[PDB]
Symmetry: D2
């Protein structure tokens, strides 16, 4: 017949079988003897307020929509697991790395960035690769992307950036002037901009790309010794990226390409997978590191920082109900069990606040009470109560104040943070010029070869060319700073475009 | 050693054997090492966004409150069950009345009307007596008051009325001028105003009061024969009211007098109960009734239409967590299973809409998904999906349109609403003059005794006194029309208060 | 220099030549010193909760999104005026037709139906054409589409219909099975299902299509004399539509082609306009009409019910802030001022409820207080108070109960709805068999030509081909019921599809 | 006639006289013909969905309530101005203090702490005194209290503290086992607990108590020099407290005693006023100072740190509409104009988040857009956009990303916050031991006389007399740790109650 995805309803009805159709009830459970004709006074008379089957049903349809994610709105999710294949415990004590073989159920959602709920997957844009570990020490949310770096290092420029990447406030259209006037004013973006306008800007499906945590993190062992790290989960399906024409086609032929590709892969048992590594780095080294170690616009070279294998990431279960399981999924970077802590990364720091904050608005104050979000492999005990849409028992009638004297939830000297030291005037430090060329330069010449460079510039040229001459100048100028050739090369194409 | 109530945390810590701790965790489930001292820079430095322990808890704290019931904000709840003791199947084919012995679990909520969440129980106001019958056909909400009548008979004046019974738009104080200027212009209230300022005006606890569905409903047997009815559930603890004096004392001595009573009663195994009856009135009779059988400001004389016993209401368990189980409840008059239907009672007609409406707002669209409100003894299946805070599995990946060729839920033609015939134009018919005195008089000089007759006139004059003069007259005028010795009695009383 | 839409920011900066930039402030107005670098404890230290500039901005960014329209999500809007050009004061006493030359401000929003916010503009799909008239008697929203009919005729099927027209509950992809299973089973759609798949399914922008009320409405004059009617507003720019070819190209080349088109036309002064006509069926004729006169899947042949000019609709003003002025925009079919009323059209009926309903959710309880939604050309005086995000003065300290003796607002007896008569039993009268082929046949034969019939069956087959065989069978069957030739062309052309 | 409050409507009519009342309309401005009788088919017939007048008004009524503040729900409000009478220019460069005689609009809401919206005004509970200053540098919210200290000095303890003061998790009643349990295990509260149970526990209205910025703040002049200060606003009407029985009866007599008292004062011309003072402490001194200068349970003595005069606070205007103006009022300690800055206070720091956070919950993302909260004497311009119920034009078509090259809002280097250098390990420094008795001892003995002292004990015992003996013991122990006779005295009383 057709793909497993397209055969959704069929398979469902068969798995049903002789079973008789459940009785069609109202939201309240009352049966409905006829849900196709409205209660009216006469066969051509008014609809009666009395028809509560209608109002019950209808009224729910009127509220079916919740706000889409402010970014990474378009995406698909799957459920699988994480299996430990190595002992990394000598660095981090996270009970999720306790011992080789220990499997931890995971949830994942891939996505793009700019486009809204109804956009196409096969477009150039970073890619969301969020992983949720339902550990026994609560939930670990590794909110990564398919890139190890980002366009900026100060959370303060995120809202502004995303704006420049979406629609003009008045026309509602995509604005090249917004996109570029911005990037041009913030060279610190050059690194990721490059990586973006390259063959990695449009990966062929989610199964054919890598996942990165970007931010520098922190691991704490048993003795309480800490280290900075980088999470890397390389794909076992091999890197496969799409072409401008192939994506441009798939944009209209099948805007949900990734979604369908992913569903089908797992639906046929062809489970995609990823290996997970890390990059350990001592505070002493971080002291020596040539760049800001917690600067999101940079990477920790493999040469000096080899990747240590941790375990495996398998996806083998497709969502049953997409809304209740994927749409509602919510990953909060602040969710790190004892053993994994954040790092002084300005960018990351801001995220600690943003995810639960927005979740409280997209899903609701009690979003953690949603199944897909609930840490079902841990016992939630604390002194928080009420809040709209409170499921479960609300910790019944246990003591809500802390401390107390009636045997209620307690501390955890073992689950204490790792104390590091910091000195310096508590102020706003201008991190504007922490070098926006070095790593971009190497990328451009070492990692890229001549044909890839050829593409990079045409890709940039085809978009940049729509911005205003002045922005273009400012833009090209920045590329030259990474390399005279980068500039002139793109410059060349532009003048052409301006036909 | 105090009452059961006061010894809440007590009995809790006790029954905790013999078992430690659960570990204090965040919402995510990550254990909290120390949650008594904010993570700060230096012993006298600022706060770190990095203290997600803090942010996480504070955040939740900032959202515990939700809008209180528009009306009937203050109250107590309890659970138990209902059981059949009489066969009325020759009247209604509802599964809740199946055969004698049939035990249907229930949830009940008592409350006041005008006062807010802070107000006290022990004051002059009607009382909210709502029953939630969790049946196999869905939930059946019997939303009723401590009286069989109300002040008005057209939903269009309820909001206006409920406004008059609350604070001044400007001062935020209770305003007698509002109350009585409204009552005066609408004599239909006479009947209920009288029942309000009568000894019944303030019961002693929720246990010593009666219950009523107030409105006229519809019953239909498995044979399709329908007949108008009126529910009645009298207390088995005997009717017991509270002197104006006591009420006021209790008012401030224990604003929550209603709660603890009801609570302890059950705690000390002394479970409350009421005797459910029904008044049956064929359509024929209804066509003959000297009054509108659907007028909320009227009663069915017991002599002409006696009470048939049908069952017992037993509240034998107290809520474990008030919020989750009582404040979060949801009673929907529209929730009537097969065998039970509404009547053209203009007020009821309005409640068919307003209740689910507000619930969606106070609690949220998926409020029927809240445990307390979910019909757990029915298989809720249909074509409704999503909505904010969507719990459950959202009915999985089942066909979502009706009709469908994939074995999704079918309709049960055995629950189709009863087919009645109405003839006449669609218009706004004035019920303002549907006799607002007759039944009132027969209640004054007939139901009440000279003794309690004077108490009434006193109670009324004490409030009416605070109203403007032009307000006081019109008011009396009405009473005068119920019986001269009624208005004159009050008037006289007024002039005295009037100095 | 490019199209006016592109230079949006240019002409802006250009717009305020003079004028010096405003000061960057927080939400509270507090002036911002440095908005680019967060306040960390040291150049490489953590983030301080003490940084309010951050939090303020971030917390807001995090809540920018609201639920998109449950249907007709992706749209475009404009403002202009409506002028009366003919006297139809004998049919309706509506103040908006009050006299030749009279101009009434209007707001308009065009749209697709199924696609979400990211979706492409140029796709086969009906098109929405909502007009809000800010008249003296309050607002009058005429919520029309680009077709005079619809797919169903009973609101209870609508939620289902849409569900089918959207993503699969599990895969989240578009399911043709769903689409055609629904249509195949509900033959009342044939009519619209045909129009839709005809060249009219993909209009060339919004400026090249007619607008219709679709529903039969009731007009009422000064003598209380009522008549039924149909609203039509034909484009003055000429009917123009895109070919499946260009339409599919534009889909990826310019997903917002409709937006960009409407903006530019206005931006350059080339204002689009439509002439509004109306048909008039007298209560008598409605009775002898060959079909049900309130059946949305039918039409009043120009032949027996000639169109009558009324005035002109002109759009000469682009939105300044899309979100605020278009996205937040809301239309309620229930918003009809004196002299204009509904018919018993089952579909129109449900609509009277659903729009104000959703708005109360998508926008919020007081959504009528949002600028674009406020009937600023009328004085809202009533007994409504409070609700979240309540602006203006909340009607100040005015009496909040009706009636009252304090001069608060009074009703207007000349706005009382025209009273009609209906008789019969109050029940769910089945309408699934009200002739779903006659008018459909006239379309396939008299309104189209061979060249066209060829494209239609080609367009139907293109999509339908993806539905299980048993489903196609069912569909072809229904087509044959309209005309043998019809089902064949599709069937044959289908057989070609199945290799 | 009676007082101004009682004659509210009476006056509204009079002044509003010589004017025909407004036409009653729907939310959409459509005039309603009859708003007293619903629309039904026939006199005793069902209600029609057709009746949108009904649904409109009802739907809005069903949504009047919003969540009440989590703390300080019961309060009263008013508006006035602030007048600088003295020059502290050398301390703060805050425009509010610019010159002598400089008037600035203000808003004020007084409140209790634990009691909900329906609770009574006169009870032992602190008092809220929030002053909203609408200055040119944005609004400055001085969220004070009627006391200078607080029960605790760490944020994490607050949500827990507040719980002990509110209802029980299950029985939902006020619980002394929690009240005292928390206070027992937490001896730092000793200072405020003594102050609370003192004569100052129940002020005779709001006009007879003082105001205290409570926390320690930082002031910055034009030359970047900072200093730590305390805000004081002494009552001009003099300190007048209510008796324990006077207040206890007034409780049920007049639950809105504070509300009325204030409304009338202003209403008759007797405007209440307060004098604003500032205590100043230099960093040097802040060094020698001998407990934590930021500890909230500690106060600066006028002795070594004298009270400097700053200006006047006068309230000469009542709210016209309570909901819109007082209920919707939102004060954010985080709102601080240039010249005013937080201080290391853990407590305060924590308040910097809760307030805006909870507001976005209780009121909505755009709460600052509600009139009374809007910083109208300032010019809001930034890069924040959209959000639900977005009022205004949303800043129109202005560029929305910063930095940009199109002349959008620029920043002010002048408003750059004062930089304070901090050193020390980053961890959760225990503050449970910072003297929880010294200052307190100086009250019971020095500040308090024999008389008051007698009741302080009596007041405490009277309450604590309901907690498990094992709790009482602890309580007394901490009191004696304050001073032998303190606990001893209490303990004595305790026994008599123990019966
Ligand atoms: C008879 C069944 C119908 C019902 C119950 C119904 C219901 C709805 C609902 C609940 C909304 C949603 C969006 C929002 O305001 O956020 C909506 C939007 C829309 N409907 Fe349908 N509708 C019906 C038929 C149609 C027809 C047949 C046309 C035209 C007369 C139409 C045109 C529109 C348009 C243009 C929008 C979105 C417009 C805007 O706010 O600018 N609808 N409808």
């Amino acid at each position: 017949n057709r793909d497993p995805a397209s055969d959704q309803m069929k398979h469902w009805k068969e798995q049903r079988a002789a079973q008789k159709p459940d009785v069609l009830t109202t939201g309240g459970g009352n049966p409905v003897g006829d849900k196709l004709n409205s209660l009216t006074v006469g066969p051509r008379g008014p609809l009666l307020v009395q028809d509560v089957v209608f109002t019950d049903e209808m009224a729910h349809f009127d509220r079916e929509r919740i706000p889409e994610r402010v970014v990474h709105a378009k995406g698909a999710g799957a459920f699988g697991y994480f299996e430990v294949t190595h002992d990394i415990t000598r660095y981090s004590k996270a009970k999720v790395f306790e011992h080789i073989g220990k499997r931890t159920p995971i949830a994942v959602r891939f996505s793009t960035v700019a486009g809204e709920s109804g956009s196409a997957d096969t477009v150039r844009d970073p890619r969301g690769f969020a992983v949720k570990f339902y550990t026994e020490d609560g939930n670990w949310d590794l909110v990564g992307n398919n890139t190890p770096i980002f366009f900026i290092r100060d959370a303060l420029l995120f809202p502004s950036f995303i704006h420049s990447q979406k629609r003009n406030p008045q026309t509602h259209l995509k604005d090249p002037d917004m996109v570029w006037d911005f990037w041009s004013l913030r060279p610190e973006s050059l690194h990721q901009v490059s990586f973006l306008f390259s063959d990695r800007g449009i990966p062929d499906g989610h199964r054919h790309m890598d996942g990165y945590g970007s931010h520098t993190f922190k691991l704490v062992n048993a003795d309480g010794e800490a280290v900075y790290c980088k999470f890397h989960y390389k794909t076992d399906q091999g890197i496969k990226n799409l072409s401008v024409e192939d994506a441009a086609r798939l944009a209209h032929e099948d805007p949900d390409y990734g979604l369908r590709d992913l569903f089908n892969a797992i639906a046929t048992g062809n489970y995609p997978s990823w290996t997970l590594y890390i990059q350990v780095m001592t505070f002493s080294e971080a002291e020596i590191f040539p760049f800001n170690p917690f600067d999101l616009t940079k990477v920790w070279p493999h040469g000096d920082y080899p990747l240590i294998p941790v375990g495996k990431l398998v996806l083998n279960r497709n969502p049953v109900n997409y809304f209740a399981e994927v749409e509602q999924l919510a990953f909060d970077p602040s969710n790190m069990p004892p053993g994994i802590e954040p790092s002084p990364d300005k960018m990351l720091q801001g995220r600690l606040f943003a995810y639960p904050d927005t979740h409280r608005h997209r899903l609701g104050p009690n979003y953690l009470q949603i199944p897909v979000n609930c840490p079902y492999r841990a016992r939630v005990a604390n002194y928080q109560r009420d809040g709209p849409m409170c499921m479960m028992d609300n910790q019944g009638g246990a003591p809500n104040y802390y401390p107390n004297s009636f045997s209620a939830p307690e501390h955890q000297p073992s689950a204490l943070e790792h104390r590091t030291h910091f000195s310096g005037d508590v102020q706003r430090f201008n991190s504007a010029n922490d070098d926006n060329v070095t790593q971009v330069r190497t990328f451009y010449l070492k990692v890229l070869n001549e044909e890839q460079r050829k593409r990079l510039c045409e890709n940039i040229a085809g978009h940049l060319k729509d911005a205003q001459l002045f922005i273009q100048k400012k833009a090209v100028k920045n590329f030259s700073d990474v390399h005279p050739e980068y500039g002139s090369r793109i410059q060349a194409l532009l003048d052409k475009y301006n036909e």
